[PDB]
């Protein structure tokens, strides 16, 4: 059977392992995974694109679809979530957020608050901790998380804010701390079977694998967390 | 034999053909398929999951939207090439400078709409920064594309016009009068990036390196494009 | 940036220098470090685990062992270039061709020692297959290497000689009378392969395809080598 | 912070890459540097007094010379993994068993060369022991290595081929039709051992047991290898 999956492109590295495993888990089904923006994938599903399963970055796109009656609602669940973490150079004395206030911390790298997802949550966290106005003389702004990583690696920034899934298998940086879930809005990836599919039966089975222990640990292998 | 889907701004077409044939000689194992279009429509397709391996846009705008949606291999984001905004005229025109603009040697100045035409946006910035825009309002006629600005400068509907230097190549009918000072406007950049969803990242990265290399650079320069600062 | 270690037969040294400067023009991101030696010993180092990325050999024997021991990326095994066994004389000699070997016009035929010198081993094959080896025994003189063969022929000590075409380039003092038919001897080929233990397999595969490309092949042909089939 | 020098046959490279990142989880402060070479050349390096902790050989020909020459810790020489000789065809090639070899369904059988390719040597022992080698001569075509065997079967040039099972993982363009009886060919084994001259005898053994442990013996299993 052929299942069509649309997904946020940030899951591509984790999704390679899932397909590969699922071949062993079920030889019968081959999966064609499609990657794009959750907004545009939302459009294609609204316009009747033959997708069997949808995993978006965030509740927003999925919420519009549920109301628009295009999802099998009982299949609408949270797949994984992400952690905003504080990183630094591997060889520095940063141990916590209280250091950002200190002389020890001169430069803090964050994504652009408006058009970088990690920067939005980073801004949201510093705002709620009342540190945002305290660190304006330290906050430098990057175009993406790669640049936040690179500035922290090369020493251009003392510490940075980034997803934990952006840190896996990288010896050059160290995850100093993890941000409290209660300090920002949930960074979640929902998954749902599409109603217009002709493989609801098979699509349900694949989603169950994704939500199963065998699938969740694969996602943990790439820095994602369960909900 | 890997097949690479390259999407590029329609402006790059003539130069992209030479790039294509020259990469055949350096790598026989890569098959390049290049479809062109406006940067916004090409950006649109990548977001829908269209299988494109490499993207070359005119403007930085379409890139940081894609990058924000995490559809790019971020470390492959580079400035490929640059352009110059040039003042052009009829080949026989007595105009010889930006100084001639505020004199009565010039009746009409053709520019693109500053809101919907990039060459118009840069022209605006130049006229604004040079403090010439108010004095020249009685001369400014507005076009819907760079192809219209040129067509007005030839056929004498406008004495003078603002276009990219790359539009001026292979036209003996129009002559470029003066190159706009780089200091007076936003960088006219054609950035390139490998698409994250690509199934041929390494092959794409390799091809991008060809564009970013002395041979690719020298090819773009044959069609009026310029070295990145 | 990537640093590739290439080990090649010491005969390729002159060609690999033009390969380096030319690859740099199409890929700024790769630094090549080329080590030269005897193919058999180069094989031993790879067998010991010496960090090599690409290997270019003089013969097929050493590739077979390496592949048997699984030290190669098998699907990258290819024939890069091949050489030709040619008949040479002095520039002013006026020897016409292979037919002139049997005539009284030539008295001394210079060849490499049939076991110590590969060009001699292939000369022996040609003369054997053409049934000329016995008739010519009174004419055959044996050199320690092709450099001595060329010297004898240049000085007139030998009327003609057998040598690789690549040993003739950049020398007007001698002239290539005729190239031996390829049907008459075992293929004189130089195989290339990416090394399995390499930490830059893809960068190595990409550099290998430059070698197998039209421009890369044409570089080896500047140095007397020839395209494979 | 201990560095371990590991000399291993180049067969295990892809498997060891998953061993390294996992032992990194099990032990944070050990640096694994894996040297890949021919087992005969790694043997020579060990014989010169060169410094290695653990040796993984392809076959026991080398690990016999060293064990005699008192260069090993004898109590650490065990068989790490074995290999299986399997029959393959393309995916859904309608070939079902070893029976089809003698039918018209199969007209071309790809094996490695008998005296150049290890998998070609064992497939030879099998067909010989199965009294099939003489009957099937008009079907037997010989490849330069297992990659080419696979290539012929994927493409359809050969209807059927013999390779190791570890050569067939993560490939959906062929089908492992049948495993060869282990009794019909010489044992295909990889021994492991700690060299006497290691700076860290104990550290290597805590790595050895990890490879011998279920945790390692299942990383190998997903790379096609088998228990001993």
Residue boundaries of the structural domains of chain A: 1-81+188-227, 82-187
Fold match, B1-82+189-229 / B83-188 = yes
Q: A49: which residues sit within 8 A by CB, 6+ positions away?
A: A6
Cβ partners under 8 Å of residue A30, min gap 6? A1, A2, A3
Which candidate, D134, D180, D177, places its Cα nearest to that of D159?
D177
**B207 — alpha (psi -120 to 50), left (phi > 0) or beta?**
alpha
Which of C43, C46, C49, C66 would you mutate first to test chain D, the one with the most D CBs within 10 A? Answer: C49
Residues 6+ apart with CB under 8 A from A92: A158, A174
Identify residues after which chain D is interrupted (C–N over 2.5 A): none
The Cβ of residue B49 has, within 10 Å, a number of other Cβ atoms equal to 22
Strands C160-164 and C109-112: parallel
Q: Which CATH architecture has domain C83-188?
A: 3-Layer(aba) Sandwich (3.40)
* DSSP label of D58: S
Contact by Cβ (8 Å): B157, B175: no
Give chain A positions within 8 Å (CB) of B51: none
- CA dist C223 and C169 (Å) reads 6
CB B43 within 8 A of CB B66: yes
Strand partners, D191: D79
Domain A1-81+188-227 has CATH 3.40.190.10: yes
D11 annotated as ligand-binding: yes
Q: What is the resolution of this structure in A?
A: 2.5
Q: H or E stretch including C174?
A: strand C174-179
In 3D space, the residue among C82, C76, C32, C75 whose CA is nearest the CA of residue C58 turns out to be: C82
| CB-CB neighbours of C104 under 10 Å | 6
CA distance D150 to A181: 50
CA distance C150 to C165: 11
Sign of CA dihedral A6, A9, A12, A15: negative
* Helix ranges (DSSP H) in chain B: 13-24, 39-48, 61-68, 118-129, 146-153, 165-168, 201-211, 214-220
Joined tokens for residue B119: 């060459």
Q: Which residue of D has its CA nearest to A16?
A: D170
- Phi-psi region at C135: left, alpha or beta (left = phi > 0; alpha = psi -120 to 50): alpha
Whole-Å CA distances, B77 to A11, B66, B194, C56? 20, 11, 7, 34
For the domain made up of B1-82+189-229, the CATH class stated in words is alpha beta
Domain spanning A82-187: which CATH class is it, in words?
Answer: alpha beta
CA atoms within 13 A on the CB side of B98: 16
Which residues partner with B163 through β-bridges?
B86
Query: Mutating which of C51, C55, C65, C70 best tests the D interface, going by the most D Cβ atoms within 10 A?
Result: C70
Q: Give the C-alpha separation, A40 to A44, whole Å.
A: 6
Contact B197 A9 (CB under 8 A): yes
Identify the helix (H) or strand (E) that includes residue C60: none
Q: Is A96 exposed, middle or buried (0-12, 13-18, 19+ CB in 10 A)?
A: exposed
User: In chain D, which residues have their Cβ closer than 8 Å to the Cβ of C71?
Assistant: 10, 36-38
Tell me whether residues C27 and B206 touch, CB distance under 8 A: yes
Task: Please give the angle made by the CA atoms of B180, B184 and B188, to the nearest 5 degrees.
Answer: 75
Rounded CA separation B171/C27 (Å):
33
What count of other Cβ atoms lies within 10 Å of the Cβ of residue B36?
A: 15
CB atoms within 10 A of CB B199: 12
Gap between the Cα atoms of B49 and A177, Å rounded: 35
Backbone φ and ψ for B3, nearest 5 degrees, come out as -105, 120
Say how far apart CA A142 and CA B61 lie, in whole Å: 16
The tokens for C56 are: 């270019």
Under the phi-then-psi rule, with left for phi > 0, alpha for psi from -120 to 50, and beta for the rest, what region is C70? Answer: left
Structure tokens at B103: 């004199």
B28/C214 CB distance under 8 A: yes
Q: Does domain D1-82+189-228 have CATH number 3.40.50.300?
A: no
CB D4 within 8 A of CB D32: yes
Known binding-site residues of B equal 11, 39, 119, 146, 164
**Are A29 and A206 a contacting pair, CB within 8 Å?**
yes
Helix axes B39-48, A38-46, angle to 10 degrees: 80
Q: Which residues of D have a CB under 8 Å from any CB of C?
A: 7, 9-11, 13, 35-42, 44-45, 116-118, 144-148, 151
State the nearest Cα–Cα gap between D93 and chain C, in angstroms.
24
Q: Pick the closest to residue B71 from A17, A39, A21 (CA basis).
A: A39
Which residues neighbour D217 within 8 Å (Cβ) at sequence distance 6 or greater?
Answer: D81, D211, D227
- Consecutive H or E run containing C75: none
Alpha carbons B174 and B177: distance in angstroms, whole number: 9
CA atoms within 13 A on the CB side of C188: 27
Which of chain D's residues have a Cβ under 8 Å away from the Cβ of A20?
170
């Amino acid at each position: 059977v052929e299942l069509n999956i649309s997904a946020a492109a940030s899951l591509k590295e984790a999704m390679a392992k899932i397909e590969e495993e699922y071949k062993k888990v079920d030889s019968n089904v081959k999966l064609t995974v499609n990657y794009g923006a959750s907004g545009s994938l939302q459009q294609q599903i609204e316009q009747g694109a033959p997708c069997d399963l949808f995993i978006s970055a965030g509740q927003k796109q999925m919420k519009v679809l549920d109301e628009e009656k295009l999802l099998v609602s009982d299949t609408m669940k949270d797949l994984v979530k992400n952690d905003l973490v504080l990183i630094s150079s591997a060889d520095s004395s940063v141990s916590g957020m209280k250091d950002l206030t200190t002389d020890k911390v001169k430069k803090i790298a964050v994504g652009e608050a408006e058009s970088v997802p990690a920067g939005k949550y980073a801004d949201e966290v510093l705002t709620n901790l009342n540190l945002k106005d305290k660190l304006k003389d330290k906050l430098v702004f990057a175009k993406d998380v790669k640049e936040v990583l690179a500035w922290v690696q090369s020493g251009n920034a003392d510490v940075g804010f980034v997803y934990f899934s952006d840190t896996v298998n990288n010896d050059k940086i160290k995850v100093v701390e993890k941000t409290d879930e209660k300090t920002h809005s949930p960074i979640t990836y929902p998954v749902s079977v599409i109603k217009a599919s002709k493989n609801v039966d098979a699509a349900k089975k694949f989603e169950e694998f994704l939500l199963s222990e065998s699938g969740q640990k694969i996602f943990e292998e790439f820095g994602y967390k369960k909900v």
